[PDB]
Design a binder for this molecule. Structure first.
Ligand SMILES: CCCCCCCCCCCCCCCC(=O)O
Ligand SMILES: CCCCCCCCCCCCCCCC(=O)O
Ligand SMILES: CCCCCCCCCCCCCCCC(=O)O
Ligand SMILES: CCCCCCCCCCCCCCCC(=O)O
Ligand SMILES: CCCCCCCCCCCCCCCC(=O)O
Ligand SMILES: CCCCCCCCCCCCCCCC(=O)O
Length: 581
């Protein structure tokens, strides 16, 4: 291991090496032009090949942090452009690297990347495929400087595949656009999870993180024994703690180490791990992190033996409370992959609460019996919600299902901005489409995955621009009570109806040309504004108003003249509607 850079180049391969180096530099120097970074990438790459030919080369023996930091400090416009960051160059390793980490800018001021015309895109992709993909990789990287590089590289390769298909199919846009949208969604969903995962570690501490980890690791690896799960959870915590810190190389090494260990003890962890461990170093950790749940042992007893009916229960628990609780959590989770992780956490927490209560009683054995009865109401809470909502999603379209939620959440929290209500409602709708297609056995984990990001996304926007105490109570409580807290929201009896505005309910003929997506958005925007103006409207009354509107649109988008119909019958619709409500 004379040369760190030489070893990295051999493991990743020139192409991946280049791509990752571009991402790294793009994540630090986020305000330097693309051609600058390209020059860097080629300089580092050529040097690396020098080191590959001969590890004893002149600078080959240096550290990757040292080499990276030196390159950063050779940027001529560094001080001018980045000010303080240029001061880091006086610090010495390893203090320097930390200094660079400190002055990494999160979400700087840049204009939103606008998706160009399909013809233009495919044409660029054909003429210069490499400078086309890398330019966009650079653009994504600079705007998401804390996103894990190998993960950003993982999406890049998927983008490249998308164009390869569609850019030579007659109806390109019909192919490409629904693929780019999927990527956009997944990319931001992945990014959200990461910030969230890291934020929770900081917010609630290592313990809660370990509890979360124990549940999911037990679910995924139900054939694994607790001692093994403990070591994995222990290491996973170590990894998340370092990765959350932000050092790419340190984070990468810890990840690689865990994947290394997991793949070598495959037989002792999971049977569905063979293909993941076969993949290259770069993809190992990724693969393991979302591997399929292993199938659990047929001969599995009930927990009641070791956790309820047994003697030595307070003694075993008091001897190591968190260990014993983790065992309960492990034992329970591996039997129920059909549960959300947070559900298992409510149960383990419930088990904990009673032991703290009953072990202090004269005879604990009775208060244990109470425990499992308490589990059932907590378990059915999320189960019922899923049944009903997926039924609702079945009867009504995804669009009409979104509108159902729309009215519901507008009446629960009317103070929220209209655009926010429309967005969260459309997204919860999408969750319905994706999860309700699963059977019950897999529905709850599915919902938890999407609601987690949607609910924390929701809480982030509220952080910046608070609008309700009840929403801030939900956003700032335990991430296990979060979703139930939102579900506990009732209709706001406080809300004063917002004053009428004819403009808000004034529609022109342009909506007849609008795309299917934003005709809906404009309609849904008005639906929120309707519910806000008269929040005490019944479902029948609201349906009536919406029906008249719907026919009103089809009557004006069907006429020889249009803009007059929208202004004349529009006047009629608004008047009649104000009267009914
Ligand atoms: C490799 C870097 C990814 C390139 C993505 C190009 C398309 C960007 C359009 C944005 C969007 O519509 O989601
Ligand atoms: C391998 C051992 C890991 C430790 C297991 C800890 C189990 C804790 C049980 C209660 C759920 C923890 C949820 C955190 C929320 C809280 O701080 O109350
Ligand atoms: C002089 C070096 C310049 C900087 C080098 C950029 C960082 C390249 C290392 C990234 C490799 C990631 C390792 C695999 C990822 C994983 O297993 O999780
Ligand atoms: C699926 C339908 C989605 C409709 C939005 C409201 C869903 C409410 C039930 C989701 C349950 C979440 C499971 C994880 C948890 O225990 O909180
Ligand atoms: C910035 C403020 C945003 C507030 C958004 C108000 C709408 C809340 C949506 C709650 C989603 C959680 C769904 C749980 C299932 C349920 O409805 O009971
Ligand atoms: C004050 C009353 C104002 C009258 C305007 C009525 C608002 C209509 C907007 C909601 C549209 C519902 C869409 C229904 C559909 O097309 O399926």
């Amino acid at each position: 291991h004379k040369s760190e850079v030489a070893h990295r180049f051999k493991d990743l391969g020139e192409e991946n090496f280049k791509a990752l180096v571009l991402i790294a530099f793009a994540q630090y120097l986020q305000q330097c032009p693309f051609e600058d970074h390209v020059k860097l990438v080629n300089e580092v790459t050529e040097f690396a090949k020098t080191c590959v030919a001969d590890e004893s080369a002149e600078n080959c023996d240096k550290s990757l942090h040292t080499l990276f930091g030196d390159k950063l400090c050779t940027v001529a416009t560094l001080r001018e452009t980045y000010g303080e960051m240029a001061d880091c160059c006086a610090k010495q390793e390893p203090e320097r690297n930390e200094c660079f980490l400190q002055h990494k800018d999160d979400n700087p001021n840049l204009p939103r990347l606008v998706r160009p015309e399909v013809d233009v895109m495919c044409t660029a992709f054909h003429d210069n495929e490499e400078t086309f993909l890398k330019k966009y990789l650079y653009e994504i990287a600079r705007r998401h400087p804390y996103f894990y590089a190998p993960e950003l590289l993982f999406f890049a390769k998927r983008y490249k595949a998308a164009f390869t298909e569609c850019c030579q199919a007659a109806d390109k846009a019909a192919c490409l656009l629904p693929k780019l949208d999927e990527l956009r969604d997944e990319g931001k969903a992945s990014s959200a999870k990461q910030r969230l995962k890291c934020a929770s570690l900081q917010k609630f501490g290592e313990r809660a993180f370990k509890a979360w980890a124990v549940a999911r690791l037990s679910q995924r690896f139900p054939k694994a024994e607790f001692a093994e799960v403990s070591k994995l959870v222990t290491d996973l915590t170590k990894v998340h703690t370092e990765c959350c810190h932000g050092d790419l190389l340190e984070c990468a090494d810890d990840r690689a180490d865990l994947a290394k260990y997991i793949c070598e003890n495959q037989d002792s962890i999971s049977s569905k791990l063979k293909e993941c461990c076969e993949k290259p170093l770069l993809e190992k950790s990724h693969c393991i992190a979302e591997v399929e749940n292993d199938e659990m042992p047929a001969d599995l007893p009930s927990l009641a033996a070791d956790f309820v009916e047994s003697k030595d229960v307070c003694k075993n628990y008091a001897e190591a409370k968190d260990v014993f609780l983790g065992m309960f959590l492990y034992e329970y989770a591996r039997r129920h992959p059909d549960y959300s992780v947070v559900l298992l956490l409510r149960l383990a927490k419930t088990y904990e609460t009673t032991l703290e209560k009953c072990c202090a009683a004269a005879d604990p054995h009775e208060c244990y019996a109470k425990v499992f009865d308490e589990f059932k109401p907590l378990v059915e809470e999320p189960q019922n919600l899923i049944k009903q909502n997926c039924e609702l999603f079945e009867q009504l379209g995804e669009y009409k299902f979104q509108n159902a939620l729309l009215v519901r959440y507008t009446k629960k929290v009317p103070q929220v901005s209209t655009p926010t209500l429309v967005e969260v409602s459309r997204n919860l709708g999408k969750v319905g489409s994706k999860c309700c297609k699963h059977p019950e056995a897999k529905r709850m984990p599915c919902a938890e995955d999407y609601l987690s990001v949607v609910l924390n996304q929701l809480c982030v926007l509220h952080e910046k621009t608070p609008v309700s105490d009840r929403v801030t109570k939900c956003c700032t409580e335990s991430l296990v009570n979060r979703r139930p807290c939102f579900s506990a929201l009732e209709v706001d009896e406080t809300y004063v109806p917002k004053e009428f505005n004819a403009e808000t309910f004034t529609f022109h003929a342009d909506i007849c040309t609008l795309s299917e997506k934003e005709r809906q958005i404009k309609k849904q925007t008005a639906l929120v504004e309707l519910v806000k103006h008269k929040p005490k409207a019944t479902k029948e009354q609201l349906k009536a108003v919406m029906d008249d509107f719907a026919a009103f649109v089809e009557k004006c988008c069907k006429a020889d003249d249009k803009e007059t119909c929208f202004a004349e019958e529009g006047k009629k619709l608004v008047a009649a509607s104000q009267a009914a409500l």
